[PDB]
From TrEMBL, chain A:
It comes from Chlamydomonas reinhardtii. This is Uncharacterized protein. WD repeats lie at residues 96-139, 321-354, 415-456, 457-498, 541-573, 583-617. The keyword Oxidoreductase does not apply. The keyword Repeat applies.
């Protein structure tokens, strides 16, 4: 049976991916966006988390209700639906399918009575929904193609006939006076006056009439809402703004994040001179700022997938979680060590994590022109990764959180003017050599002591995904896109096999016994094969609702996992099939995964960036 | 390590320079604050070509802004990337040139030119090695054209060997903004011929045509035109800033483009310009980029190359591309359109390849064409200038600033001589 | 005191967009034996 | 790798083409967003026949939509599969042809035809190898028939050797939608006889009869008829797109079907068309498919083959089937109905087998019959045309758009000559 232990995911691209739940005495203090679903988790890690999943594609907008409700928005698929989530129920409350294209932004009224939803494409509508029943005003039209960046509500002017909604769309600010009693929307464009900046975040004052807009130019533009005009501008945090939050108590203060990790306190009063001086610096680019733990922490998020807790009484910085950013492609386990898990990504970053507490043991970083880490292999003191440029880089594994040092690199391992990027790296049992598979179907065995090429093995004509080395100087590939897989020999001579199916493969694993080989096909079929047999022993049809993308295998040969585009990982007995345990927790198709060297433990990764840890007992 | 000193002149030049610096900072991962947030080594590898390092991680553009009216650079400072520029590099007067080239070149430009050259010399002396200066401005504007020509003359005097690149917005053929556009353009072309080593002609109506036909935008403001100009300005120098499979600097482009020193005016174009509707439906291939590049609609100059003959043409491609594909495509284009290419130059194509495509684009290609088509642009400008000068309309405004009437005749004669050279190499026969 | 109006579903908008689906739905609503043009 | 360029004309043609592209995208496993979700190698093996690869995994249909009023294209774009088509392939005018062949062929079809040929040339030059073009449109309508004949003539001029396949919706015998259907049909048939290499006649009343009798659909929408037509249009070319035990391309079908160049009109039908009630009751065998196929009610043309004589007949079967079984069935059909088959051709059957049946169907078979029965349909169209033309009713609109009256006489003479040829080969005796 699969038990979900922890999910590490954060949509670092979004501004406000993570957000606190104010006055949350119960569980689920924080809510993060990682992909299709929402990770509603406690402030402290190593605690159970819930997965609010009701969408079909990525989430484009996330909104808090200042305590009481969450909201996530869809994207494409003709079902860009605004879904309201309840804290206590943890279930969808309202499903507004009124936007033909992805919902650009969504926000909640300061009194948690109104709901603003804005689309951008082919129907640009400022829908205002009541907490009871449905919508109040149809739209105000806007214009297609105008990217609605962010939105905010005025705490003041809540007389039932007025509700001032500020909307930043590109370099345009608009104040929308909404009469919900009559359901009318009047949109006044703010007179810029040579002030053209892209607003990352918007926030009204406590008493209103002063709207602070943080821009990418590290500036907060203060605009007079009453006159609907830009009043002034002050630099706040070098690097940008990101997240802008009203001060927990404040005189006129306003906490500002920065892309440099700085957190400062900007006040409108205090003259034209600022002389920036942050009171706290977090690692990475700040995108979220809130307050929780009974308003004792600042709960600052990061574009790098990080969540951090900043104490208010002593400014103490404590990390909470880290999320690998990008499309995660491979999971590796040290040959004997179950405490360290390596996760690669299409972004040039590999995270080695301590599975005991899901902390970042070490990080491997490479420039974007080096391709993406499409396969990974962990060692007691090394991380070997095959990238999108065909190169295989081995980095010195570090501890405590640091950039790893590249010990060596096999250059141009798989790049032959028709396919670049090595996939499905594997290490020899005990450790003797390194099996690698190219994007075009070439298998290559590399010495480890001298890094010299020992075998080039080219029969498969398409992508290799799922190579595996047997127990004695032999190996086998999977060869996606050509629906066949062949067991080979290191003497540069294929040993028979070459079993062809009917559909293209996606992954292949070898059991503890040297005769059992599992393959997974896009036909959502899991095929079991005996090396001594010319035909697959059996096949399980419709293993997943959608295409299966990855297959694993326990080192004992008892069970093998299967992850697919249905976001659900299942476990199947090696010989009897069946479902030992299955669960859907990734907010994306599952791309790769790895069993622990011991009985307990399965680590899977998704295309959005979500890493899910599993206890098999 | 080959530095470039950027200068913006006039309102149009300042806006174009602000957009260009925004684009370059986005390409290098520089936020409006000067700090690097790009997460790529190559972005910082050659950042010194345009930027200088401050006390911290701040990167200050090597840009110098000129104007006679302070409002334009107030807007520049308040724009998205107004805070990267060092405040000492904003050189401003108090009374703007009333669209008067004479005011911007003789009376009011004389006082401010000392400060402008001081800032330019300060920026140049800090450079390790200087590739040269690029000046972005508009022909047909008072302060822009006047101060730009004066500064180009001064920098030519000070640094003869250093490269001079100019992005001049020539007044548009059909719809003219100001009345004195022919006068300012005629006076400025005379200076650009003599001083500017390399010059690019841009027309706002050509930009409107390309952005309405290819980009299919509905309400294109000046920001979009500035964005296209910035794209070309970046793409011409991306080989300096990024590794290239076959890299080519500005001097290499000038050497392979300019057959004779006076014929240094080029029409430029950027590919691939795709409408938002057809962005997915198109395919980014070397043949597609070449096909869109050699289309006359892609040209940012009013003159269409079909009428003239391509003296030379450089194509700077960006991305992971086949040099064989590039060379074959351009040779095939030359063979197919041998009528439009000069006979006494066997190869009219200077192909360069850079390893780093612009952000968002898998592939790109900027084009710099030296063809006799620009002859018709000069002919039209002269056709307006002669009509105005025959009756001496608005002549007193330039005369009262202290420049002789004979200067108009000299400029017109020089420009007509340039037209004659273009026609001569249009209809020159081999052997 | 907020005024409310019923939100329509995505299926209704799709039916309005598609000529075939709307006409088939109307035929199904036409009458009770075998429905006229029952199969969408 | 033998590409086909699809063209849709008029409202009926656009609707039929949209349904056809929906069917083909479903058969190749392409979602309305264009991404491949088809889960089979053979689907992507020959997807280039109808589609081109976009930037990503998106596949753009090689289709060109032509119309004079934008409403039909707006509806198609808003439809379920409106987003796969490249927006540049939508060529529309502004004022639609009022059911006027003259407006669609001379006055208004003239201006849009340049854009249409431009898009056609752009699509065709991208093709590695071109089998030809397939044009779906309706006889008896202004814009459809007008630009259909005009574009077919232009493409015949440009690409003489390349195949021309047409799916023309001939006006139905009993129920007529518009008054000027006989005029438009008379003008269009004359063009098709000269230009179209292969022409496929479809009648809305025949479609209504087949879907009311075989399908037992009681109130069939136009979408149902379009989808039957789409099934036929897919099945005619499935031998190009999928491996076959005995494959036969469009040119092979045309060679085996057309005895003499002017006798290139065919009636078609699809099998197995089963009513929902009897779907479990019907068992699919090759004899069952042939029995349904040779039935006169199965033909999608109103003319029933019993009156005429089968000159030739090709049948493209699809599915894992016995070639012996198929050949025996067709030989037995010939022997049993030898009275209905032309004597001076020993074998009037071209049997083709493809190994890939359509979605949902274990086996299928599309039929293409060249028989003299089409004589009676052309005879009826002439019977209406002559009755109208004797009194010159509605003639003044066609006259005021600028064709001589003699064009009507020439078209009627050509149609009568075609009828005479069909009768000649109906009653021709061997030796
Ligand atoms: N592409 C572009 N052209 C501009 C812009 N602003 C002005 N222009 C053009 O530049 C020409 C000259 O104006 P300009 O030189 O800036 O005026 P000046 O600064 O007082 O000399 C005018 O005809 C405008 O059409 C701009 O932002 N972008
Ligand atoms: N099978 C079918 N026939 C149609 C459809 N739409 C129109 N028709 C028929 O086609 C004939 C010609 O109409 P059409 O050419 O589309 O009109 P036009 O576009 O203005 O030239 C009419 O008599 C209609 O009965 C359709 O969607 N399917």
């Amino acid at each position: 049976p699969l038990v979900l232990r922890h999910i590490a995911g954060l949509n670092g691209q979004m501004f406000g991916a993570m957000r606190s739940i104010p006055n949350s005495r119960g569980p689920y203090n924080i809510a993060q966006i990682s992909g299709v679903s929402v990770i509603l988790g406690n402030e402290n890690n190593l605690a159970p988390q819930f997965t609010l999943r009701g969408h079909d594609d990525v989430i484009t907008a996330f909104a808090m209700s200042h305590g009481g409700s969450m909201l996530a928005t869809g994207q494409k698929g003709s079902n860009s639906d605004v879904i309201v989530w309840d804290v206590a129920a943890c279930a969808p409350k309202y499903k507004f399918q009124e936007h033909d294209v992805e919902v650009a932004t969504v926000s909640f009224s300061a009194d948690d009575r109104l709901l603003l939803s804005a689309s951008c494409f082919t129907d640009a509508k400022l829908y205002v929904w009541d907490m009871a029943t449905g919508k109040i005003v149809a739209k105000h039209g806007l214009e297609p193609g105008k990217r609605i960046t962010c939105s905010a509500w005025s705490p003041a002017l809540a007389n039932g006939r007025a509700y001032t909604c500020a909307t930043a769309a590109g370099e345009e600010l608009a104040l929308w006076t909404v009469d919900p009693f009559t359901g009318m929307v009047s949109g006044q464009k703010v007179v810029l006056g040579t002030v053209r900046r892209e607003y990352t975040s918007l926030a009204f004052s406590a008493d209103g009439a002063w709207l602070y807009g943080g821009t990418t130019s590290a500036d907060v533009v203060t605009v007079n809402v009453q006159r609907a005009s830009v009043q002034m501008t002050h630099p706040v945090c070098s690097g940008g703004v990101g997240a802008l939050l009203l001060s927990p108590d404040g005189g006129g203060a306003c906490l500002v994040g920065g892309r440099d990790g700085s957190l400062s306190t900007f006040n409108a009063a205090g003259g034209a001179w600022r002389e920036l001086r942050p009171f706290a610096k977090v690692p990475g680019c700040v995108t979220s700022l809130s307050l929780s733990a009974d308003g004792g922490a600042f709960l600052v998020g990061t574009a790098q997938g990080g969540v951090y807790r900043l104490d208010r009484t002593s400014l103490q910085l404590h990390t909470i979680s880290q999320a690998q950013q990008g499309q995660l492609t491979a999971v590796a386990f040290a040959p004997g060590q179950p405490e360290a898990v390596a996760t690669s990504s299409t972004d040039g970053s590999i995270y080695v994590w301590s599975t005991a507490d899901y902390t970042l043991q070490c990080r491997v970083q490479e420039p974007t022109q080096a391709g993406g880490a499409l396969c990974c292999v962990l060692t007691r003191d090394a991380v070997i990764s095959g990238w999108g440029d065909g190169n295989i880089r081995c980095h010195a594994r570090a501890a405590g959180g640091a950039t790893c040092a590249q010990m060596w690199m096999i250059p141009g391992a798989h790049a032959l003017a028709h396919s670049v990027g090595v996939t499905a790296l594997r290490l020899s049992n005990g450790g003797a050599f390194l099996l690698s598979g190219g994007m075009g179907g070439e298998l290559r065995v590399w010495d480890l002591r001298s890094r010299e090429m020992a075998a080039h093995m080219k029969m498969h004509n398409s992508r290799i995904v799922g190579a595996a080395v047997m127990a004695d100087d032999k190996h086998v590939a999977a060869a996606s896109e050509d629906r066949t897989w062949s067991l080979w020999d290191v003497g540069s001579e294929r040993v028979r096999t070459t079993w062809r199916g009917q559909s293209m493969f996606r992954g292949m694993a070898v059991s503890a016994d040297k005769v059992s080989v599992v393959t997974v096909t896009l036909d959502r079929k899991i095929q079991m094969w005996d090396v001594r047999g010319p035909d697959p022993r059996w096949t399980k049809v419709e293993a997943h609702g959608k295409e299966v993308g990855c297959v694993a295998s326990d080192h004992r040969g008892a069970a093998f996992a299967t992850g697919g585009a249905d976001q659900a990982v299942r476990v199947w007995d090696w010989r009897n099939g069946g479902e030992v345990g299955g669960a859907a927790c990734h907010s994306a198709p599952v791309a790769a995964m790895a069993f622990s060297p011991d009985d307990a433990g399965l680590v899977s990764v998704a295309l959005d960036g979500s890493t899910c840890f599993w206890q098999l007992t | 390590m080959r530095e470039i000193v950027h200068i913006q002149g006039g309102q149009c030049g300042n806006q174009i320079g602000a957009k260009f610096w925004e684009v370059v900072s986005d390409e290098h991962g520089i936020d409006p604050t000067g700090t690097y947030h790009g997460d790529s080594d190559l972005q910082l590898e050659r950042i010194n070509v345009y930027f200088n390092e401050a006390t911290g991680g701040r990167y200050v553009p090597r840009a110098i802004l000129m104007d006679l009216e302070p409002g334009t650079m107030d807007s520049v400072r308040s724009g998205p990337y107004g805070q990267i520029f060092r405040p000492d590099n904003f050189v401003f007067g108090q009374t703007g040139a009333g669209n008067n080239w004479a005011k911007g070149h003789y009376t009011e430009g004389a006082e401010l030119i000392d400060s402008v050259l001081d800032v330019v010399r300060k920026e140049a002396e800090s450079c390790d090695c200087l590739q040269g200066f690029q000046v972005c401005h508009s022909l047909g504007g008072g302060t822009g054209s006047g101060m730009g020509t004066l500064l180009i003359s001064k920098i030519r005097e000070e640094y003869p060997d250093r490269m001079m690149l100019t992005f001049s917005v020539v007044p548009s053929p059909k719809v003219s903004d100001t009345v004195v556009e022919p006068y300012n353009a005629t006076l400025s072309v005379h200076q650009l011929v003599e001083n500017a080593d390399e010059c690019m002609v841009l027309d706002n109506e050509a930009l409107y045509d390309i952005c309405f036909r290819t980009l299919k935008l509905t309400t294109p403001t000046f920001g979009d035109l500035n964005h296209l100009i910035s794209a070309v300005m970046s793409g011409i120098t991306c080989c300096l800033r990024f590794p290239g499979q076959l890299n080519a600097d500005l001097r290499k482009l000038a050497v392979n483009l300019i057959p004779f020193p006076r014929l240094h005016f080029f029409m430029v174009g950027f590919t691939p310009l795709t409408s938002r509707g057809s962005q997915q439906y198109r395919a980014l291939t070397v043949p597609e980029l070449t096909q869109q590049m050699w289309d006359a609609k892609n040209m940012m100059c009013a003159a269409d190359p079909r009428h003239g003959r391509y003296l030379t043409a450089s194509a700077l491609f960006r991305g992971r591309m086949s040099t064989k594909e590039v060379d074959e495509q351009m040779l095939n284009v030359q063979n197919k359109n041998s009528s439009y290419f000069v006979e006494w130059i066997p190869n009219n194509v200077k192909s360069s390849v850079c390893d780093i495509p612009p952000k968002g684009l898998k592939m790109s290609a900027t084009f710099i064409g030296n063809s006799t088509a620009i002859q018709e642009m000069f002919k039209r400008v002269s056709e307006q200038f002669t009509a105005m000068f025959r009756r001496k309309a608005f002549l007193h405004w330039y005369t009262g600033e202290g420049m002789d009437e004979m200067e108009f005749t000299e400029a017109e004669s020089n420009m007509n001589d340039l037209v004659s050279e273009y026609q001569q190499y249009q209809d020159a026969s081999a052997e | 005191g907020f005024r409310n109006v019923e939100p329509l579903s995505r299926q209704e908008r799709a039916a309005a967009r598609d000529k075939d689906l709307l006409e088939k739905s109307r035929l199904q609503a036409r009458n009770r034996l075998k429905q006229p043009e029952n199969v969408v």
